[PDB]
Symmetry: C5
Subunit: 230 residues, 5 copies
């Protein structure tokens, strides 16, 4: 059971229920957008669904840990969700371009998918101590650099500028990725490589950031689906 002074556990509870709510929202609304937009909504629901399932597990772990007198929820177990949800979120950049009928190579899809996995496998390997934390940071920054380029100066960026319906959503989502998602590499540096931030602080931040970095991402996509389904 969650104790009352435990803000980390409160944050796990909040985000766990938010994510169940988000899942149902995307799935149920996805049934009522134009067919072109249905896949978008599906991906959003999947993202929130994986997160929900994992947060249900992770919250249990935390609470146990707090009863056993040493509260910890290691960042490394986050990757069980990130390995799935982060590639899904990134392919949404391709998917919504397709939905507005932008012309865009499938090469953009693979660039997005590989860059995302390079980024995550680098960090996971570093956190799981399979390789040096420095080497994991570098490999992960390479992945980052690829995805950032795709959506800020690469094909997907250019496709989005050509289309006008998606242009503004694309701009919102790419900002979340640029700025919203910067907490993760920051946690890896200051949390993990430097030890300047405790895991409990990190867990609160990561938990609260999921309102932006996943739910608001999905709601921006729903907003354009619904304006385009008109």
């Amino acid at each position: 059971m969650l104790q009352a002074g435990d803000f980390v556990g409160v944050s796990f509870w909040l985000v766990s229920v938010a994510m169940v709510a988000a899942t149902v929202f995307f799935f149920y609304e996805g049934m009522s957008v134009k067919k072109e937009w249905k896949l978008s909504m599906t991906i959003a629901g999947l993202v929130t669904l994986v997160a929900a399932i994992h947060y249900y597990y992770m919250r249990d772990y935390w609470v146990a840990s707090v009863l056993a007198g040493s509260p910890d929820s290691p960042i490394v177990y986050r990757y069980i969700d990130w390995l799935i949800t982060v590639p899904l979120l990134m392919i949404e950049f391709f998917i919504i371009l397709k939905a507005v009928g932008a012309s865009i190579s499938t090469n953009s899809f693979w660039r997005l998918l590989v860059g995302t996995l390079v980024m995550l496998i680098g960090g996971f390997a570093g956190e799981a101590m399979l390789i040096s934390a420095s080497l994991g940071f570098i490999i992960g920054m390479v992945g980052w650099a690829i995805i950032i380029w795709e959506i800020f100066g690469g094909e997907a960026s250019k496709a989005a500028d050509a289309n006008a319906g998606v242009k503004s959503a694309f701009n919102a989502l790419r900002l979340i990725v640029l700025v919203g998602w910067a907490i993760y590499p920051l946690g890896y540096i200051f949390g993990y490589m430097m030890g300047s931030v405790d895991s409990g602080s990190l867990n609160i931040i990561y938990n609260l950031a999921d309102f932006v970095n996943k739910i608001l991402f999905g709601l921006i996509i729903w907003n354009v689906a619904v304006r385009e389904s008109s």
Copy 2:
């Protein structure tokens, strides 16, 4: 297991099952209202769904507490649901205006959403002892004042008076918010700041009030959706 003479636990059981029933009702009926009304029904189902999930957790907590000989379910854990359900319920004021094709700025939507979060974060901070209870009450009353103004003298109020289909539902819902929802600030004053009411009494009241403050809210919205889907 729920013990004999435990009305608090009985109230948790009643409301927990009511809320599952409500969720399914809104989702299943939402499939059969006009498309304009589908989002309304979705929000209602989400509200009852979050509440159901949380009441399942909270009832477990209570029962444990009663076996351990000190029965308590602190109000603070209510905010895990309120932080999500209360903003959802309030945005229904915007959503149903849109469904009847009222003209209404999105500024009304943000005013509703911010005022609601100011209201709740103020109370949560006060209850979680992050700030003085007095300061949390004041900040929360500011949030309240904003939402009350929106639906009683602000844009949403005026839009609703212009439309005739939603006028009467809008009036019902705004009364629930004005009167039905007054139990919450009252519990904060008499329960928490004054200690004149025990948490067990509060928990019964809050549990029973969810029939009005959430379910009847949703059923009023369904009633207008169905009269307008004709």
Copy 3:
């Protein structure tokens, strides 16, 4: 685990699974009746759903009780389901009249809903020892008298006689209510006020009676929905 020779526990298992089956049936078939009939099917599914959820809880309680050497499942916990399912079942009398396009005041709906809650709150208060068992019986008989009058000599009765499609279903359902449902006041008298029947006998009877008093009620409604959806 359910032990050998435990017919009470067997009855809980039977009814718990029947009710899950019934729920899915009503929801899945409700998707394929004429729109006029969809709400009926919804209410039936809700009734069986609440019952299923509660029987899952109650069966657990019983089994525990049998391991702890004193087998009891008090009737009072039945009211957690009855408070919801009984009003739902009774409003079906109004709903199916509306579905056949009978003319029927909403006053009939409120009479049904109030009479049902008077009936149950009276009994609950009596069991639960909030008031005398005698007084709870009387108050509950008042509720009964109201609902019986509505469907045997009141508006709903007359509406049903005017319509021919629903006439025969209405007659079946009102007989279940008159006769099928008489076990409940009987249990209160002989079980609770007189002590002439043990709770274990009562629990078997109540469990088995749910085949008639809820499932067959729902199947009669489905049968007319399907003959009218043609």
Copy 4:
């Protein structure tokens, strides 16, 4: 946890997951057959759903029993599923005749339903030691004789011969009932009355036979629904 060399427990695991798979299949495909065939598919899904729920329970029981050093899963708990699933399966003989638009009295439906319950109540009473095992066998054989006659020489048999679309499915299903289902009375004789077969052997056989006696039954019905939905 399922232990090494436990084939009985392996069989429970296999069948439990098969039955979940079957349920989802029938429900999801039932959404895509002609409306005439939707009820068939519903009944099949219900059958597999009850079985799945019960096998989840029963497998837990077995595993417990094996840890407590005496492995037993008594046949008597099978009746909790059979009492529901066997009547459902048998009414499929009526339902698919209706789906092909055969002319068939509802008397055939009641004959099927009563004969099935006579058959099962007889066996249950015998196994639960409420009556002699001999008497339970006799009463159950009476039930059997009724259903066998209905589908091999009674109205349903004749209706099916008149129709050509269902003729061959009807023949397949009646053979499963004649032959596939003979394991059950055989287990009652050799298992229970004679003691010549242990419950563990019986449980393996019954578990494996559900591939034929329930799933293949449902798949034959789906096969004709889909050839008729063309």
Copy 5:
């Protein structure tokens, strides 16, 4: 709870959540492909669903095992999923040929289904020590040889070459079966009959290979369904 440095347990967590995601994806998207393709999508969802349910069980087992100080998850319990999922995956070769309206005997369907079960029953019998591991390998290789022939030189192969829409998917899927699925017989030889590979290594490999051997299989099928649903 999943412990630190447990890559086997991490792999179980990853795959368990991936498979839930995959299930929902196939079911939800299957609602939006042409009717010809709906069964394909159904089979894919079933495959991932069984796997998910089993991985939820298996991960629990592993974690227990690691607390009890001897980490093992025997390959034999894999067959509880394989016995169902592998026949399903293989019949997809028939199903998608039907969906593109290829001419193909049902004999191909039975050849696929029998060859698959021969293959698995042989291995299961060998692993469960019911027969020699050698004999189980041989019997299983016979099953393999049948299915490989069907899709590389048999009817299904030839049908697929005649059609052009499915040709390329058929080629992708048959390569996964040829190459992707070779890990399983390899594990049986080197893992089980030779002991050259520990179960923990095997479990990681098998867990990770499900991204290819089940999910990517399903996504290739979805990709052709969606290009053909256009």
